[PDB]
């Protein structure tokens, strides 16, 4: 998945690794990130340049009237002491401001734009001072191209400096596992190059090959949402296996919970719930696949059950254990983990008026459905069990209408 990173992290990566491709190390790594529990005096002792330079302070929560330009360290502290924890609505989402980037103010005239994104044939570099697109083939690389043939309109004295900068930026993009990079805008500091704003996405699948370059960074949560201990626990299980275990909480107070097998089928179950008008009651989006073991499915089921039994809802709650007919995921071993968790949550399941609906096919499915049927006869909660004879998503209207 393509994951966005803070302007602080992207500029720090550019400051650290771009001077290896470009011989113009004019851009220093003068950056300061301010979080909620950040001791101002510690960051002041870490960055002496703060007190002796003109500053820029802006929120770094993946985003206007919020950028503070050309200020003193005292004036920067005023912006920080006022805007921290401020409730703001951006894109319809209401969240508090918690992360801010402090960097030196570069007095500029020129404002040039550069962006690198990828297509099925290679990478595309976009440049503007209306916008030129330069395609870099996957097998040939940048060396095969004369980047020089760019905008003649105003470039001349610095046409070679931009040619060199965007060639180095592609190498940085290609070797550091980026999925997207945008410097809108960039400027000149004499004969050097300075980035003013930076938006970046890393391909999180590159992690194994980027242990040294990504050492100083972590992926932030999108604006508005707060980190979830349950979501990070599922991500932890997912990282130690070739199998897939994914969980995203949409609404903690939602009536409809899902534990669907597969990326494809889980989306279809969400489509059906939304098509019946129950998008608001959809408590989560999740999936498990790639033949996870009994212990892994047990911990996954335990987490969904825990989150589902925290609040008591008047019309009860529904648990949809669905999926397609599997190709290799063992239904007996996975459902053994599901049954073990349901057995543990027996008292909490009855007290929350939870109804379980199951539809599954695949290796040893008859044995797995037998476990669920035997469980429903002793647990004390309604467990409707279906196999490949029932249409995949038929348990959705059966639970939300019937």
């Amino acid at each position: 998945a393509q994951r966005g990173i803070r302007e602080y992290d992207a500029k720090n990566l550019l400051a650290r690794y771009l001077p290896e491709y470009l011989d113009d190390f004019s851009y220093k790594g003068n950056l300061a990130l301010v979080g909620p529990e950040t001791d101002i005096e510690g960051l002041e002792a870490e960055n002496p340049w703060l007190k002796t330079t003109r500053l820029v302070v802006k929120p770094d929560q993946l985003f206007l009237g919020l950028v503070l330009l050309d200020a003193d360290w005292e004036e920067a502290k005023e912006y920080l002491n006022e805007k921290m924890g401020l409730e703001v609505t951006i894109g319809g989402i209401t969240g508090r401001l918690s992360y801010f980037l402090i960097e030196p103010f570069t007095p500029h005239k020129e404002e040039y734009y550069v962006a690198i994104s990828s297509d099925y044939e290679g990478d595309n570099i976009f440049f503007s001072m209306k916008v030129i697109s330069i395609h870099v083939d996957s097998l040939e690389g940048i060396d095969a191209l004369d980047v020089g043939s760019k905008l003649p309109a105003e470039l001349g004295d610095k046409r070679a400096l931009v040619e060199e900068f965007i060639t180095a930026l592609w190498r940085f993009y290609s070797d550091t596992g980026f999925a997207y990079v945008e410097i809108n805008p960039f400027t000149f500091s004499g004969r050097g190059i300075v980035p003013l704003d930076m938006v970046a996405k890393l391909d999180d699948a590159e992690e194994y090959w980027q242990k040294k370059r990504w050492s100083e960074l972590a992926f932030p949560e999108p604006f508005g949402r707060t980190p979830s201990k349950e979501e990070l626990f599922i991500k932890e299980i997912d990282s130690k296996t070739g199998a897939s275990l994914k969980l995203t909480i949409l609404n903690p107070e939602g009536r409809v919970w899902t534990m669907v097998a597969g990326g494809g089928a889980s989306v279809i179950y969400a489509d059906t719930i939304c098509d019946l008008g129950h998008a608001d009651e959809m408590a989560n989006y999740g999936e498990y696949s790639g033949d996870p073991n009994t212990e892994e499915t047990y911990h996954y089921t335990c987490t969904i059950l825990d989150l589902m039994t925290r609040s008591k809802n008047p019309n009860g709650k529904v648990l949809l254990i669905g999926g397609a007919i599997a190709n290799f995921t063992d239904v007996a071993k996975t459902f053994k983990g599901v049954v073990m968790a349901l057995e543990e949550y027996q008292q909490k399941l009855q007290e929350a008026d939870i109804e379980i609906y199951v539809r599954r096919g695949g290796p040893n499915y008859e044995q797995g459905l037998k476990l669920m049927r035997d469980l429903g006869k002793r647990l004390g909660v309604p467990i409707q069990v279906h196999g490949p004879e029932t249409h995949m998503t038929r348990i959705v209207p059966l639970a939300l209408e019937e």
């Binding site: 998945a1 989306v267 719930i273 939304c274 007919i325 599997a326």
Partner: protein, 616 residues
Amino acid sequence: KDYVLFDINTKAFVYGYQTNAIQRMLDFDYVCKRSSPSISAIINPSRAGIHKAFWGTKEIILPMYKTIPLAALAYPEADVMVNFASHRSAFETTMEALKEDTIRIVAVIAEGVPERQSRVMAATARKLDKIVIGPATVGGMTAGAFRIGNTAGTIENIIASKLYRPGCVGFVSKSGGMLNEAFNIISRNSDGIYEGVAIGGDRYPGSNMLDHILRYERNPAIKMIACLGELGGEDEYMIIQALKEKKITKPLVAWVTGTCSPYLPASVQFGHAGAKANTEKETAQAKNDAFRQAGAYVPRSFDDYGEMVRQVYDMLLTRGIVQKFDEPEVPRIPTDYSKALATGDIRKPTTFICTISDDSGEELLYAGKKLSDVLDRKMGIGGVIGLLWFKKELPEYAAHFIELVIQIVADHGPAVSGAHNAIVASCAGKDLISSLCSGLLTIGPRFGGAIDDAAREFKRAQETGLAPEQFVGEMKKKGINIPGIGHKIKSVKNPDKRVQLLISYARANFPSTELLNYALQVEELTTAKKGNLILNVAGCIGILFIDLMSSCGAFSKEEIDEVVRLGYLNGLFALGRSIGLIGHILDQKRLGSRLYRHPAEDIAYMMPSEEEIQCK
């Protein structure tokens, strides 16, 4: 034909030791009536060798090679590689296979492969006119001809979905699990799939859906195209553009999942790596609308996908475009024993019984008692022997008598038969186990192993009412030595303090020593004749053990008779004396001892004459 991916003559390598996937492929080949398996060799980077698997009910051998070039050189007819390498090695192994002139198709199963690596694999495949299915896919299959690894699951599912014979539908999806669900949907609403492929859910696949859709358009056997896409990326726009440019003339059923997305937050990343609509164009709504406008048969929701398939198939059937065919005979395959056993269908008797220990549960049991409770109760080595040999939790003094015996017989110098043989084997450079067994194999009637017979013979004499003098007299008349009597170095002049130590313990702790008292009377008579005819350590152990069993209350008369008859007590000497044997072996290794050869001057060589060997 360029449009054919796999046929009934397709030969493949399976990269990675995936025994279940290997069996699934062979089972499909068998039910499809193939003459030979679809797998030429297995590529196992850890080991070269052989792999045994089934061909119906018959076992066959598949060769296993360490590398892709070695396997390709051995089986040049194999043009497909089913790659089960992890996401850490999927790129280099696929690229190595693509560089082989004889490999044309590579299916990449791994999830978590970088987008850049997939871009390079896709471009390498297109440049060399090869095909990459994946990453992050089960694969696909040509009905009745070939299956990629685990594609279409169990043979039961293959039979229920009629995948052993081709239909008229050319199918392609992103999702692996949905490809199997679709095989079921299509089989129930048409004559089934001819071929089905899952390209994976990554946003930069090795092959796009259109690559496969264009092959279906050229294939005359396919009269209907069906596809299931999803939100994120612009793959489906290649199909819509081909549909608009009249490149796809066959009727196409299409559905794009992800209609839920606008109802949920924009930040939600779905299961597949590429399932995230970055732009409006990437949404399921924009894709399904553009599909409708391009002339495709688009259902109202996923629920009516099979109904749209049924409508398009029925249309072809009435118009004569597709012809009704007779259903071929339903294939059969034996069920795996493990499945029949798990479902309770069958029962199989055990050959052995074990009553002394159980290692099959959560905790090791010694005669039913958890090892934890044995240790918490400080039963000791004597208590462990009570459980494992006698199946009793013995009184403490009985467990301590067993431990006392082990210490007393641990060693009796290097000169005895067992220690001597173990030393000779150790001097010959033998390992500890061989040297130990060389010495233990001397334990028998003259050395060490007299304990069982001493217990047997003294118990019989005392029980049948024989006076000690009558027992001594009877054994002499039969020409049988009294077991437990006599010694090579110990005698009246050189008393055996080990015997004294065992006797003092029994007098202080056993409720009765009647057999010992009888044995000591026999000893007075034997030593009166010859001083070396003492009650030896083996006789002392056997006799005292009978008194221990008789008086401790833990054994019935029958249990004692069984112990005597079966021969338990020589085990005590073997166990105890193993301590000294191992010590002697180690002593010779520390000393750097040389090979021993018995001196010639200690052997009288007395060959028979020529006359003696010629007749009697």
